[PDB]
Ligand binder design. Structure first.
Ligand SMILES: C[C@@H]1COCCN1c1cc(C2([S@](C)(N)O)CC2)nc(-c2ccnc3[nH]ccc23)n1
Length: 248
């Protein structure tokens, strides 16, 4: 009878209420006015605030606590970049994230039940096993490529100011890991689309002959090599995930 997305959304909104009530948080309650803070979008790529977060909850945009927390954490990350890692505003934003984490921990079993009702694949043992393997390929093989650090995380526009003018469809290994953690990939095909986007963006930003692109090529190649080594197992997992998906 009960729509678990409604129940989840009410929990998330309550957390937003609690974070809004923390001291000195008003600078985070609504979007930054980028006409008064005239350099804001030259530095920040993914703006976020509590009003936008709440509207997104009400748009039923967060099927689990992961997607919600990712957006909440942008508030902290943006403040660390724009104001500084130890600025009072960054400490204030971190106090909101800390409270969120306390509330999520209090409610973790309830949240897990709602999340699996919304998306039964989150509790499917073949999906979980498939995602586990992908994450290990990323951390033990792809991130182990020498000098692969430029590809481990999203580019910070503060440090590479023209990056997102050139690269409008960015991708990086942390984002892929976040996608794995959310069970975004049900087979290798979608995973390889994101992996190859890293390489394509290197060709575009750094050039096809750049050492950065040679490193990106090595990341892609070790991914192919490892997927091949695990092909028989991965194929069975993919088949069983498909079956579970048809059933859900
Ligand atoms: C532009 C280069 C090459 O293509 C891939 C992305 N690349 C990055 C990525 C990063 C990040 S980061 C610190 N989160 O922004 C993700 C790790 N950083 C710097 C960088 C930053 C400052 N000076 C630099 N000099 C040369 C590179 C460079 N390049």
């Amino acid at each position: 009878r009960t729509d678990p997305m409604v129940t989840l959304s009410s929990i998330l909104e309550s957390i937003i209420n609690d974070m809004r009530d923390l001291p000195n948080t008003y600078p985070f309650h609504t979007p930054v006015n980028a006409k008064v803070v005239k350099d804001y979008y030259k530095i920040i790529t993914r703006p976020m605030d509590l009003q936008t977060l709440r509207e997104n909850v009400r748009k039923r945009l967060y099927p689990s606590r992961e997607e919600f927390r990712e957006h909440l954490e942008l508030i902290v990350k943006n403040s660390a970049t724009y104001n500084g890692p130890k600025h009072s505003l960054t400490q204030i934003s971190q106090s909101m994230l800390d409270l969120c984490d306390e509330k999520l921990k209090e409610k973790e079993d309830k949240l897990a039940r709602l999340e699996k009702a919304i998306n039964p694949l989150l509790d499917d043992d073949d999906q979980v096993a498939f995602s586990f393997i992908l994450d290990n390929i990323v951390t033990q093989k792809m991130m182990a490529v020498p000098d692969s650090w430029p590809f481990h995380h999203p580019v910070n526009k503060k440090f590479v100011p023209d990056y997102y003018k050139v690269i409008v469809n960015p991708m990086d290994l942390e984002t892929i890991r976040k996608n794995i953690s959310k069970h975004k990939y049900q087979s290798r095909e979608s995973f390889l689309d994101d992996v190859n986007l890293i390489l394509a963006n290197s060709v575009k930003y750094n050039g096809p002959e750049s050492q950065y692109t040679k490193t990106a090529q090595e990341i892609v190649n070790v991914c192919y090599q490892t997927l091949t080594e695990y092909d028989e197992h991965l194929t069975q997992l993919e088949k069983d995930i498909c079956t579970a998906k048809e059933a859900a």
